[PDB]
Amino acid sequence: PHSHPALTPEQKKELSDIAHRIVAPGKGILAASESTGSIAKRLQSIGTENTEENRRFYRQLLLTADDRVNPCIGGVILFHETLYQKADDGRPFPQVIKSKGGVVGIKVDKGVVPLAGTNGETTTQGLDGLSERCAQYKKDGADFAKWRCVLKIGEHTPSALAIMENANVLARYASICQQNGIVPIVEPEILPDGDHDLKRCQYVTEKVLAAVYKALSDHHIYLEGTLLKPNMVTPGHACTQKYSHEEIAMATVTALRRTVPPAVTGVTFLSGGQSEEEASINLNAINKCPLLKPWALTFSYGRALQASALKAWGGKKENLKAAQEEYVKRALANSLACQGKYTPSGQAGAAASESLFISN
Amino acid sequence: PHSHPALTPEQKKELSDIAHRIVAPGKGILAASESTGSIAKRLQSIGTENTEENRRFYRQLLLTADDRVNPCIGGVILFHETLYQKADDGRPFPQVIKSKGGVVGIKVDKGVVPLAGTNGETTTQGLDGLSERCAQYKKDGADFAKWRCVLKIGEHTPSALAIMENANVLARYASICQQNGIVPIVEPEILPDGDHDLKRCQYVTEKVLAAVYKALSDHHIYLEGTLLKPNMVTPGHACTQKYSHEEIAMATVTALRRTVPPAVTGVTFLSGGQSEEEASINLNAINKCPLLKPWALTFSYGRALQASALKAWGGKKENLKAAQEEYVKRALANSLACQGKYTPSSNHAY
Amino acid sequence: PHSHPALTPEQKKELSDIAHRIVAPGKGILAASESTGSIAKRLQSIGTENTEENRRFYRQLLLTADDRVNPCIGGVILFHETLYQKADDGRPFPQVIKSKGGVVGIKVDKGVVPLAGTNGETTTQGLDGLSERCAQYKKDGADFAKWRCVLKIGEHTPSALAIMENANVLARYASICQQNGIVPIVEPEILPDGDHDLKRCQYVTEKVLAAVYKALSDHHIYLEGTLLKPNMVTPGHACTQKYSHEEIAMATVTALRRTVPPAVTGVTFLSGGQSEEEASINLNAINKCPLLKPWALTFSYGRALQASALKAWGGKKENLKAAQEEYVKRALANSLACQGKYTPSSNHAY
Amino acid sequence: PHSHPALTPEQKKELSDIAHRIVAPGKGILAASESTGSIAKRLQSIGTENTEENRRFYRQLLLTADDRVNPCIGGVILFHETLYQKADDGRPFPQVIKSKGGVVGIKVDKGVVPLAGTNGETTTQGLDGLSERCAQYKKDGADFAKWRCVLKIGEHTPSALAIMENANVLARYASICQQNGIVPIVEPEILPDGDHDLKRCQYVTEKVLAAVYKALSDHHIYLEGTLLKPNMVTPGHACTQKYSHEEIAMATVTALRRTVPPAVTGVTFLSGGQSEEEASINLNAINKCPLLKPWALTFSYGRALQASALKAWGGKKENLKAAQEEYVKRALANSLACQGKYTPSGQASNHAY
Incomplete structure (x- = not known):
């Protein structure tokens, strides 16, 4: 029943300011923090050797795409290794x-x-x-x-x-x-x-989130200085019954509205194996859902932002531009999606339609 | 866990519809559900015998106030006794x-x-x-x-x-x-x-509400079909430090934003001893608070809607109009307050 | 983390003394608190009208059995109605x-x-x-x-x-x-x-009892002043796999040893549908189980103490003695059972 | 409400047998697992450089005490470093x-x-x-x-x-x-x-232990394959009111009886700063307490077993025997205490709680 401030007003401001910058209007997160054992699989899919240099090169490819992604990417998640690697010009990736x-x-x-x-x-x-x-x-x-x-x-x-x-x-x-x-x-x-x-x-999802926020309260967590990365609410990957994007959006927004306090700065959905297009389309339907949503609803995509890129790269340095262009395309689509302004034009590509699901 | 639907779609619709009607824009709740023993002190303060008839007449006085209260009152809480009493014209109070x-x-x-x-x-x-x-x-x-x-x-x-x-x-x-x-x-x-x-x-308040909502989740409560009646966030009655209405509003809204799910249809503040004006001014500040509030922020006032009316009545049947007039004035004041339109005349710090 | 004593040393002593008397060595509980609706089937099973007098007569039949039951019965649970009824001699049943x-x-x-x-x-x-x-x-x-x-x-x-x-x-x-x-x-x-x-x-059983005792602790319950009436650990009534009495005993004692604090004065098992003999044999096996048991392990039987008595009675007054005789037989059998002295004539796997 | 066995019967048997050997009648635990930073203060109180060799020599001093400690010590807690050190004869300490x-x-x-x-x-x-x-x-x-x-x-x-x-x-x-x-x-x-x-x-203590066991239950912990190392129930160090050893024992045993399931194999008390003699007297009193105690009530003492030994050693090799004698004396005393047989001479209410 007694308060022992975990954070000072200054500390809270810093945390809140950071959280807001990451999910500012039209912005999302590029989740490129796959470990070596995790990314190795993605590299083997394109016959690329899983070496430190190849990993560095691939991450540089994503991080140095043209300025069109600037307004789309509010944050980038890196793995320990990548945080200490540098681009060809000597600039540390964080810079x-x-x-x-x-x-x-x-x-x-x-x-x-x-x-x-x-x-x-x-x-x-x-x-x-x-x-x-x-x-x-x-x-x-x-x-x-x-x-x-x-x-x-x-x-x-x-x-x-x-x-x-x-x-x-x-x-x-x-x-x-x-x-x-x-x-x-x-x-x-x-x-x-x-x-x-x-x-x-x-x-x-509702039961899990209720448990999550009760725990955060018990541990005195400053919600305004946090972000939530939940799964969208969807049927199981092996479910027979089919659903529309509007139904997925309604189920997702409802679960969130019933468990996530307004103080939470933003919700950054994981793609969870959905194709690049599906992840974008669902995020768009979510933002268009006719229910009050007191928090930013955007993305923190790993696979859904890199599918077409990896394929366009193929481990070949000469395909740099081609690969980056595919990434930029998904960043623009999701930037529009997290604003509810996305309408697939039909030229996403076969790679953007393939299921990125991996059995667990 | 596994789902064993506590409510059907139809049942949910009914509850949600009821909840929304009560806290519709500009509307609040008149809490007139005091028990015989609870109303005792108040009747004593005006030298009026605590009889069922006087309790009936008083409740009738409030319930039959003129049409000006209509857009101000979305709901009226009654005590068991009153739910089964009738007005002089024979109409059941619920009617x-x-x-x-x-x-x-x-x-x-x-x-x-x-x-x-x-x-x-x-x-x-x-x-x-x-x-x-x-x-x-x-x-x-x-x-x-x-x-x-x-x-x-x-x-x-x-x-x-x-x-x-x-x-x-x-x-x-x-x-x-x-x-x-x-x-x-x-x-x-x-x-x-x-x-x-x-x-x-x-x-x-934050710890209590966090506990309340976790319990409602465990018990499978349909939030869209509920209302929350919490205390506003204020210093204790014996606190020597002074605060502005804006600070009260900031602490209250901040507390709610950190614990109350958006799905909750509405928040109806109790007056908890605050004076009629104080309760109205604070509710007004709460609605003017520059923070995003996903739920209706209105009133569920007992004392803050009846103080002056009770005193004007004084148990005198001939004071009917004077008394009702006081209640009407407070109903109007709070209706404007829950819209942030009432005038008597650094969030990181929270 | 601050104590606000729920009970004084005197109140604790009274509660502990009562609890110990109920489960003193060789003693158990006669659960005769069936409600009118719950005893209905019992009476109709023997073509007996469910009247207050027949219920009074039946309860009197059990409560006035001869002194042979005295050392077997540490307590008797009654239903509200029966607590206020009297025997033919005018003596209140509690007396x-x-x-x-x-x-x-x-x-x-x-x-x-x-x-x-x-x-x-x-x-x-x-x-x-x-x-x-x-x-x-x-x-x-x-x-x-x-x-x-x-x-x-x-x-x-x-x-x-x-x-x-x-x-x-x-x-x-x-x-x-x-x-x-x-x-x-x-x-x-x-x-x-x-x-x-x-x-x-x-x-x-282990999960439920663990929850039960955590709740008792949270509510400041004085365990020494309580008794536990759990189900014995047995396979389901329709389980295809069969088990021995020793296995039931081992599972039951192991579950209790893993969840019931030594402070609990006694455990009074419910019969839960088991036959009179089955309930006595299992209770006996539980007491003979080669594990340390820090609490009295006895009975709180309703059906397992009345089955034969009810049938022998059949609703006829002339069968009073015959009926009481059957009750006495089960009281004697279970008194021996709660001591591991009754005769009808690898724990790591748990 | 469904079981997915965390352990097989064989695994349970192994854990139970280990737990019982540690707290067998008359036995307790020597807690010598002080970290390098913790043992540093111990060595400074006797003006001895905190080196690995000095740490090894000290741990050896305790571990190689004469056979008199054998029936007194059911277990010895070691710090990582010590688990991999060897005695002068080349024998690993674990051996x-x-x-x-x-x-x-x-x-x-x-x-x-x-x-x-x-x-x-x-x-x-x-x-x-x-x-x-x-x-x-x-x-x-x-x-x-x-x-x-x-x-x-x-x-x-x-x-x-x-x-x-x-x-x-x-x-x-x-x-x-x-x-x-x-x-x-x-x-x-x-x-x-x-x-x-x-x-x-x-x-x-009652509130903490109830929470501890509810958590162990939630995580499906096999109690028979565990031991509890709690503080004895005593007044605070700065408490003005005085209490007897009998009252400390009654409060301690009462607290445990109300929270610790009988399935728990043993309770090994920490000395928590009490003097060697006080820790032994309190342990003996706990064992003499006139209440049913379904688990072994012994010791897991660190300071209460090393105080005098450390002082007698002083970091000097010539004091080896004198130092080992001090440790052996506390081991014997506590061995008797965890049996309620401790006496200064040697081997020879309840509702208010």
Whole structure:
């Protein structure tokens, strides 16, 4: 019943200002923080060797696209390695990102680990020494961070334990981040795996988010200085029943309205395996949903922003321009989508229509 | 978890429709559901015998005020006794309220009870046979209900137990109401008693509301079909530090923005002892606060709508017009207040 | 983290003394608090009209059995009606019970109610005005009470909500009882209904009891002044896999050892549909289980103590003695059973 | 409401057998897992340079004490460094411990960290990569571990957040340990600092332990394969009111009886700053307390077993025997105490709580 201010007014201002810049009108997040083991798969899909140089080159390709992406990208999430790499001109990637008006983010979790006594459920690790890491990342140009928790819909999942534990660790992560001037993006991803329908996903999403915000309250988290990265509400990837984009949007906005406090600065949806087009179309339908939405509704896409790019690159340096052009195209589309002004013109490409879903 | 639909689409529509009608633009709630014992002191302050007839006449006086209150009153909360009384012309009070465009509400809790092992804290009782009561009340004209829980700010209060128990009982009450087509007004009142400051009230209010909504989620409550009746965020009555109405508005709106889901149809503030003018001025400031508010911010006033009317009446049947006139003036004042149009004549710091 | 004593040393002593007397070595509880509607089938099963006199006569039949039952019965739970009835000699039933060395108990809940949004799950009501009721029952001879919560094992049950809510209401009930010098018997019954196996029942029982005791702690319940009335751990009533009495005993004792604090004075098992012999044999096996048991492990049987008595009675006064004889036989069998002295004539796998 | 066994019967048996050996009748735990920074202060109090060799020599001094300690020591908690050091004869310390009948333990937490928004409250870190660490430690001779959470009694502490978070992290630590065949010692230490009285400590201990066990239940922790290392219930250090050893024992045993499931194999009290003699007398009183105690009530003493030994050593090799004698004396005394047989000579109400 007693207040022991976790943050000073100055600290709150800094956090709030950062969170708002990232999701400013028409802007979204480029999630390019895939680890080596994670990106290696994406590189093998185009027969490109997974080396430090190739990774550096590919990230440079994305980060140095022409100025058309500047008004589209409010922030860029990088993996530790990339945060300390430099472009061909010697400029550190964080400087490159900032010079284009983007905020630099860093992935800080150390992956998922199994929860004993559950049916294949997990929690996420990475709290050890997090305070010092955040302090160092802040000095090196980072202003926000990302931490991913993973839940799955099944007959007995997500369990009470899985929900409680993941919500609690997210809260710990957010607390430490805010003590170091780092805006935490809270990511409680509910996988699309399974044959459940739209209402089932909506039910689970509402229960999970309710648990997430109660935990953030218990841990004294400054919501205005945070961002939420949830899954859109959609039927399972194996569901038979079909739904329109308007139905996905309505189910998504309703779940959020029923659980996310207005104080939360913004919601940055993960693409979760959806195709580049689908992710853009759904984000657009969401922003056009005829319900009051007190928070920015935009993107934090990884796969949905890189599909066509990776394919256009093919590991060949000579395809630089071609690849970048594909990325710019998706950034412009999503920038319009997070404003509810996106209308596919029909020239997205076969790559932009292919499912980016990966079984878990 | 798995979904076992507590409500059908039709039931949800009914509840949401009722909730929206009560807090429609410019409208608020007249809370006239005082019990015999609760109205006792007030009648004593005007030397009027606490008889059912005087209580009937007084309620009639308020319910039959002229048509000017119609666009100001979206709902009227009644005590059990009054729901079954009639005006002199024979019209049942519920009919009088509805004829003026108001929704009829009913108080259903059975008062507070002491929580053993706490420093004078309480929870509220009244769940027994509540479903049958709500069904009967619905049949008799009521569309919404009220249940009051009370919390106190002190050295060791509100405690974890009190916060948890009161939030849980509020959720049970809300669940039962919705099963019977009754919109529940969730009232977790944090008393203004004490010398604590504005920051302290905001902190406690935030923690209480966070607990309330987690409980409503656990109990599967349909938020669009509910209303919230909280205390405004203010310093304690014995606090020596002074604050402006704008600061009160900022703390209140900030507290709500951090805990109340957008899905909640409306917030109807209790007056909690504030004077008629003070309650109106603060509600006005709250609606003028430069922050985004996804829900209606209006009133559910008991004392703040009746103070002057009660004094003007003085238990004198011949003062009818004078008394009603005072109530009408406050109804008009608050209707403008919930629109941020009433005039008597750094957010990071929160 | 601050204490505000719910009970004084004197109040604790009274509660602890009562609880110990009820479960003293070799003693158990006769659960005869069936309501009019609950005893209806019992009476109609023997073609007996369900009148107040027949109910009075039947209760008298059990309560006035000979002194052989005295050392077997530490307590008798009665229904409101029976607490105020008298034997043929004019003696109030509470007096008849006490004169035989038994403590008088009273059922105080008001039945189960449906939890909206669940798959047919329930919580229990009865807290309204419970403090005053307890005060009166105490004056009228009762020293302990009973409150029954019901949980069910199914595909998605017991749910998180059902467990938390039932645990919480049991805590409220216990708190109110202790404030009035009444020892609360906490009964979180997990029904045997279903085809689930022994391990499933053990798992659910462990989770439910863990929730129950956390709630009791949160509500400042004095465990020494309470008793626990749980279901034994058994396979579902329709489970295809079969088990031995030793297995049931091991699962039951293991579940209790993992959740029930040593401070709890006693565990009084409900028979839950088991036959008279089955309930006695299982209770005996539980007491012979080769694990340390820090609490009395006895009975609180309703059906398992009355089955044969009811049939022998058949609603005829001339069968009084024959009927009482059957009751005595079961009282003697279970008294031996709660001591592990009854004869009908690898824990890591749990 | 569905079970997905975290452990097999074989795994449970292994954890249960380990836990029981550690707290077998008359046995307790030598807590010698002080970190380099913690042991630094210990070495300075005797004017001895804090070097690895001096640390090894000191740990060897305690571990190679004569056979008299064998029936007294059921387990020895070591710090990472020590688990990999060897005695002069080349025998790994883990081997030295086992050969004397003791079970080897390892401290695995990574210290406390501040909980933002609280009044100087903390939680404990060390879960990252803990599973891999536990598997490695098991392979290298350790069978149990220790994780310390710290709570403080003050005006607004322990707070709801502090209690919930510390209980939750302890449960995660316990879960990871059991998955790797390691018996976790759950240590929710409530500091004795402050002017609070005996009943205040008892109240707080009761609330903390109830939260600890609810969390262990939620995380499906196998209680029979765990031990509890709590503070004894005593008045605050600055408390003006005085209490007898009998009252401290009654408050302690009452607090435990109201919260610790009988399935818990044993309770190993920390000395928490009490003198060697006080810790032994209080432990003996706890064991003589006229109430039913379904678990072993013994010790897991650090300072209460090393105070005199450290002083007698003084960092001088010639004081080896004198130093070992001081340790052996405390081991024998506490061995008798955890049996309620302690006497100054040697081997020879309740409703108000």
